[PDB]
Design a protein around this ligand. Sequence first.
Ligand code: HEM
Ligand SMILES: CCCc1ccc(C(=O)O)cc1
Ligand SMILES: [Cl-]
Length: 393
Amino acid sequence: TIPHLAIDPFSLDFFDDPYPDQQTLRDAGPVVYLDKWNVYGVARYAEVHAVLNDPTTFCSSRGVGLSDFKKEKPWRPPSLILEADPPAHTRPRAVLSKVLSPATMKTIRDGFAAAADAKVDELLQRGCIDAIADLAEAYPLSVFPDAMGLKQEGREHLLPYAGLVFNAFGPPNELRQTAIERSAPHQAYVNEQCQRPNLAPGGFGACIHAFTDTGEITPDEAPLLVRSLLSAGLDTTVNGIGAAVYCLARFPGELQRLRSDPTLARNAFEEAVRFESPVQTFFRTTTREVELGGAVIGEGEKVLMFLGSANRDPRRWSDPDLYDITRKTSGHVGFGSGVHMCVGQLVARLEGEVMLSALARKVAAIDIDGPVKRRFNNTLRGLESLPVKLTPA
Ligand code: HEM
Ligand SMILES: CCCc1ccc(C(=O)O)cc1
Ligand SMILES: [Cl-]
């Protein structure tokens, strides 16, 4: 039989410090039932990995939030990629893979790296800065909207829209209800920018539209795929970079190793994604009765995957609660796993790498010098404010 737990993984108490409850979730069994929301939960690495890698049994087209699209109306038209299963998923996935391809990274790296170096030089002139607003947020804002081909006007709607998207995967708690209440202006802005004439030549948005000539997607699919990048492409990186800086600030020995070998920048970022898991949770819906970790789950049930917990599971990781920039990080599930594994992962890693490279070369110490404030969101883990003093190398 499956253990029933009263833990609310979407409560502010949980967000404030999820680690003890995540252990309780892992140790109760391979599959638990969360009475608060009437969903199954898997918090160990093995089951999270298994669920992610069986999209046939554990589907996405009934939503990857708590809401079951078979029962309730989606809050916005479903994503053609995140909220689709093969074979409908396959061609939109291929388009985004090509738009954000290894070859595409060559076209943006120079500019992304220059912007990272410039940002760190700017911050060093101030010394004492907020590593969230002034760095984790400022840097992606300085490169990603431009890479998308967005106009300047209205960009202030991007972070609010993303906060909404990520809150909306949650249960109908206050965070979700308030986000949806306030959604109209952000939706209006984002939806408008997804149209072809509003996306600058050569940018990711224009490229998605260009693919409508190939037979991979129709012209009416392009705006929703642009919408995907404007939903997933900014706030994720904000929280990833924030995570990495927060790790370096707390683990000075690791900052020193990074300074000594800046080639560790990419793995130092990857390890931060594992360690903090800025994207904490996703759901699937079962398409049949299924046996998972000795437990039987009926058809049409929501299954909550704890990515952050999987990334700290001692059954998989040695010293999971240590930040180690030379850890073998391959296998972590912070970007997911399988057919939906983050299609933007090369952009995320590029941003993280060039920022950590800039810090590695320019900064001697990162010392927290004010109160740290956490930001609460149904799906994202990260900080509201991280006051630090940056000492120049
Ligand atoms: C550190 C930064 C990021 C993290 C931690 C992250 C995390 C994730 C995760 C866990 C998934 C899997 C969702 C699932 O299995 O249902 C995912 C998918 C996705 N991500 Fe990322 N992401 C990041 C950055 C980005 C960026 C920069 C972009 C685009 C520029 C992006 C676009 C997408 C899209 C479109 C999907 C859906 C892919 C599919 O359904 O096939 N993400 N991401
Ligand atoms: C971690 C990224 C989560 C995510 C992925 C895809 C979408 C979308 O296609 O709209 C929105 C959010
Ligand atoms: Cl929308």
